[PDB]
Design a protein around this ligand. Structure first.
Ligand code: CL
Ligand code: CL
Ligand code: CL
Ligand code: CL
Ligand code: CL
Ligand code: CL
Lengths: 177, 389, 389, 177, 389, 177
């Protein structure tokens, strides 16, 4: 295709959109993928970030076909000048072959090293009665305990001398039947 | 104290990384209580673009691997995933690639479809159902995604709803499976699958589902004993809570003589993990401008909502409840309502008190201190507590 | 900012030690002025148990040995000893074992008895009296215990009181001995004892004692010149201050046409060490709810109490006095009374002013600044003073 | 006595009381003192702290009689596990022989060393116009100066142009006679 | 927070030096915006004595030599030199010895005389004039002293004034010379002198000077087009600003039906360096107690002064303008006037906004938020901005 | 003159005045200047500071005549005990010969070194859009740019959709003629 890089600008160059546009799977033709290695150097970061993230929205069948071409692009992105493009290229390098993202990201990456360094220590400081994930709210005790361990009982901030007014209300509504 | 535009904070990876580090630190400090405040400031940044969402979620998945407290980050990640959903962003492709969901082709396909559309369809439900009925079902952790389970809530317990009777058992089974089934693993190999609680849990859900969709509820009080027994199942309690929510929150409801709110006391008594949602609902109904209600009716209704808070407080969710009453006092609500909360709480509590409770309940006591258990509490505090530094 | 229960702070020696270190630091920082605030937070902890009281008092005795400022800690220890007394705790056994009082069997025995009972009895008074009349009397520092001297105040100058005439001279002599006698020591050996002032001091006390117990006082004004001369003795001034206190503080007193308050001006003029007690009394009478008094009578009476403060201020006790007027202004008292204090003070003061005074008197001036010496003071301050950092 | 340690619990085990109970001198029989060495190991800290502090409330005659037994108990307390019991044992070790407490408490005692270390420096910082003890308020100038030195005069925060209204009031009440 | 007397701060060189260091730091931090606040606290200290003035000005001259930002200190020094002048202190001898002005005997002599007297006299004006007409004129930087140029303002544009017609061209020429002439230097040697703009600038000043001294102005509107063209010359704009100041600021002026204020909009549009003076004038007229004006007339007049601020704001002097409106809101001005400023500003601005603007304009928006462009602005801010730390 | 130092006290000893008094040029007689070297040691700092600053108020003719005597006094002041006298003597040492002050003040002068050290760094931190001197407000663009460089344009805090109400007011007043 003639000026295939100019055409990518008219499709993904929209600064307003920062997420995958509707029908992004149809925009990424197999032939287009093979044309990206020809015009990548001149592309802006915004378009590259839409391009790279676009590979996640492709069906497993379409990805496996041009996985060689995808590896070539992701490699190109790992040699980019934009730090955002570099970071994304490091997360997707495991995708075209495994279908899963890379979570080994500390190798020669000061940002990641500084993030994980500081927060791993912070996460360990708040292990006492730490908030659980949302799925735990849907689980029976045995599934809950298997997954997250025993729940810490509520702190006793006082001692109940008598039962509240809501205790009498339960007995009433049970008597009505 | 300082304010920053989203665009600026995302343009430089270096800058974005630093804000992520402090924001995450704050959210972990705020606990689940201050989660509703500390979350949107972080989520707005992270959900600026798909690439920003990817990076932040990759960082959170790595932190979630920590045995000691990593679960708290998984919670944060799920809260952000919900933010993206509510803002029209599709983050299903990233969510599935983020975990070991992609290891199972058929299931991951059907699960991503529904997560992308944001609803449950009989086509993708059957695909999941057949697989979990076979001799070799996929890992239960796969269907234990918050975004997925919520789709069941609005499909089974929402006033309505559009559903196929020939597929209803499939919807119920998958939900009950996610709620009760327990797997054992050794070296990433699944040894056994325990389904002992699948039958009774599936029945509990089916029972309450039939009650909720029926409505008119005036038949609710008659089957109350059955309803309370089912609420003991957490998955069912979530459903009832959501159902009570959609029922009461909808305008033009307060023209009746309320059993819907009374069920909340049973929810609170059975499930500590649902306390912040119960309170979140109670404060949503406490801040609604009921223009159709009479002034005296508005007063008594708010007293009723306070009765739920005092019950919740008596179940061990006291500090976040006491904290809210102090917030609307220092900043609106009429004095009579605040005095009623104080009266009712002081009528059921007794020493010993913790310093954390006194530090919140004593200040709210001595703002407009004219109302004896009040002065006696102050006398106790003055005798037994000390300020430091 | 943070609050702590007494029990928790005392359970661990490590934790108790840390709070002691910061509390003592604060009290030493607050000076004698902020003593009344910073003390109870420390005292409540220390007086939790006898073992906690022992440890803290042992620490304070060791600090009191410092030549440079150790006296300030001895003051703190005595303030805490009083706290224990007022809360029903007996700390006489510890107090005597804490010093060199145990070196003298007979005297220490009688002194501990009365300190434990909290009153003066003729039996133990005679034992002390005979010893201080002999050729070899015990060290005067032994009877110079604040807790002991106070027992004399409520026995000699309190409205009443129960006392034996055959023992009265013994009570007077021991008090006058503690107040006037001066010993000289060399290498812990007492060289001489100076009793030159014992005769005149004993007479001063005896004179005013007879006047105070008499009352009706309407005879007070007639013997005023004698009374003023005696007030020059500090021990007597303490007595008059306490007597004026018990007289005025007792309800149903303000039905007369006040000489009792006028004596306070003479106390202030003669004794700087009694200024914080004079003010403490004046603010106690300024905050009393006189329900029996007429509104106009309440206003003029408070103006009268302010006249005492302005006099006290003019004696060099200005900063704590100015500080109190600012506290009740920012936080109650009617505007007219605050304006009267400003008027009277600005009518007698003149440059140069210190920055410490301006930092307190200028803010109180410009809150409701409508009343010229006021604007002229502001003009001076604006010309001659500078804010830093 | 049989189960003399059980009997001490029923007398001093009250958690409410943290000071010497009334008639503590009668509870500490000479024979009981000789029985404490037999049952001390099982006693709680609370009871030991009431026991040790109790020795201060005994008359000088009673103390001197079983001073050997008291030394034995105080020694036992100096080998206790509770830091509070240890601290009290170090203060009372000088008592049964001298009738006075020990104020040499820094030897191998981090707590005391940290307290005195920090505060000795703090005490020296506020030597300027430091508050005096209460007894000084009762003393004539010569006794006061001998004991505490010359008083620092009040800071002159201003200059008096005229005498206040209270000056005229003194002259009036002097004229009435 | 802490206050200090001027005398104390100047007695010790060590102490004076430390305050100088922090004061100068603060003023450099406050920028030109907060200059009017941070200056007097420093100036009062520095102008305490001639020796203190000398030391501080010597320190500031050395700092002014820094190529990067040294000009900002030269500004501070000139602000202090003005403070000394307004307090009756003569600092002309120091000012001239401070620079290279003393290198030119005749001129420096005449310049110091007028700077010491504080006015312009024909004798010393002629001496300067003849020298700048000769083939070898002195450096133009010599007549570019703020204190000197101001003397021209009150002599040429002040309502009046006492001036000689036979000398008027000499006054005009010297001013126009200081304003337009451009010299080139190489190794402290003056290569050329550019006078191309001297003719047109001299004419601009002469034209407006004749208009201002005339008055009655009712003839102002007729020659408005000529007047606007001249205002483009900064030296003339300064004159008009000062003239408008003296005209309007003088009591008993608001009895007319205002062209004087309308000229300010043209000043603002042409010269960014005059924005803080334009605002300084606008806030001076906004805080004047017009006792002769009718209540409705006072309201509309203040609305008129606000219209000038909105125009000024639209010229890029927004942050100091927004800041002032927030100050009088949180601390006086009636609500209607504040709401008008908000209305007018929100009617002309649009995204993108900076965080610095939002941090000032959003708080002023949500204090009494009842008035839709307002809520739409809040919606934008909530969507696009984030609080950090 | 007899007691010429006593006479200087009655003329400059006024603590109220801290600046050069009116007609200070007439007080500093040439003969007096030659008498200052005789009585300087006993003078107070206040008088010396009025004396030294007084040399700036003398005409260039009068200064040049006794410049030798002035150098002698300024030297004496550079050996004074008062830090203020020392600082002033270091600033004026260049004056009697050059008519200009000395701005080389860092040599063995901790105060100056600490002032300039801290502030030179502070001045460089605020070079971005730094406030200009007052004379710049009076200059045409070409003179302004030559002297201080191009002006930094105002920060764009928003974007103008329409022109304000003041724009219509300009057109009206232009139509009236
Ligand atoms: Cl549970
Ligand atoms: Cl407690
Ligand atoms: Cl005294
Ligand atoms: Cl002063
Ligand atoms: Cl310009
Ligand atoms: Cl924006």
């Amino acid at each position: 295709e003639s000026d295939t890089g100019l055409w990518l600008h008219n499709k993904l160059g929209a600064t307003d959109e920062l997420w995958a546009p509707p029908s992004i799977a149809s925009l990424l033709t197999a032939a287009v993928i093979d044309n990206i290695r020809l015009c990548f150097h001149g592309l802006s970061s915004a378009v590259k970030l839409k391009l790279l993230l676009g590979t996640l929205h492709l069906p497993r069948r379409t990805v496996d076909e041009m996985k060689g071409a995808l590896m070539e692009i992701i490699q190109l992105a790992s040699l980019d000048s934009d730090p955002w493009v570099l970071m994304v290229a490091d997360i997707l390098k495991s995708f075209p072959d495994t279908g899963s993202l890379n979570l080994e990201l500390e190798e020669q990456n000061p940002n990641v090293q500084d993030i994980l360094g500081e927060l791993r220590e912070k996460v360990g400081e708040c292990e006492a009665s730490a908030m659980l994930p949302l799925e735990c709210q849907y689980l029976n005790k045995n599934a809950l305990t298997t997954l997250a361990g025993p729940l810490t009982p509520p702190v006793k901030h006082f001692q109940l001398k008598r039962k509240p007014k809501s205790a009498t209300l339960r007995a009433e509504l049970l008597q009505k039947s | 104290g300082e304010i920053t535009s989203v665009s600026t904070a995302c343009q430089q990876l270096e800058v974005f990384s630093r804000v992520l580090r402090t924001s995450l630190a704050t959210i972990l400090d705020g606990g689940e209580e201050n989660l509703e405040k500390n979350l949107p400031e972080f989520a707005k940044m992270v959900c600026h673009g798909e690439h920003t969402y990817l990076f932040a979620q990759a960082m959170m998945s790595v932190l979630a691997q920590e045995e000691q407290g990593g679960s708290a980050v998984r919670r944060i990640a799920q809260e952000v995933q919900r933010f993206a959903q509510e803002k029209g962003h599709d983050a299903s492709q990233i969510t599935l690639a983020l975990g070991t969901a992609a290891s199972y082709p058929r299931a991951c396909q059907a699960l991503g479809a529904m997560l992308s559309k944001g609803a449950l369809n009989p086509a993708d439900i059957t695909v999941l159902f057949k697989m979990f009925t076979s001799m070799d079902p996929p890992p239960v952790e796969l269907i234990r995604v918050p975004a997925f389970l919520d789709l069941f809530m609005q499909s089974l317990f929402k006033p309505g709803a559009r559903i196929n009777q020939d597929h209803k058992h499939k919807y119920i089974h998958i939900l009950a499976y996610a709620a009760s089934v327990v797997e054992t693993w050794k070296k990433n190999k699944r040894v056994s699958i325990n389904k002992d609680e699948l039958k009774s849990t599936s029945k509990a859900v089916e029972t309450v589902h039939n009650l909720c969709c029926n409505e008119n509820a005036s038949e609710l009080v008659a089957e109350l004993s059955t309803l309370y027994q089912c609420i003991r199942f957490p998955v069912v309690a979530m459903g009832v809570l959501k159902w009570v929510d959609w029922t009461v929150s909808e305008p033009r409801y307060f023209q009746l003589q309320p059993v819907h709110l009374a069920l909340l006391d049973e929810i609170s008594t059975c499930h500590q993990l649902l306390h912040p949602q119960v309170l979140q609902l109670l404060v949503k109904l406490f801040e609604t401008e009921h223009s159709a209600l009479d002034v005296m009716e508005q007063l008594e209704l708010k007293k009723t909502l306070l009765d739920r808070m005092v019950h919740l407080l008596s179940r061990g969710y006291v500090l976040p409840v006491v904290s809210y009453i102090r917030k609307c006092l220092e900043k609106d609500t009429d004095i009579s309502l605040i005095r009623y909360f104080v009266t009712e709480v002081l009528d059921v509590i007794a020493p010993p008190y913790t310093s954390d409770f006194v530090q919140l309940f004593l200040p709210i006591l001595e703002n407009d201190s004219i109302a004896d258990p009040v002065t006696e509490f102050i006398a106790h505090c003055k005798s037994n507590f000390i300020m430091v530094n």
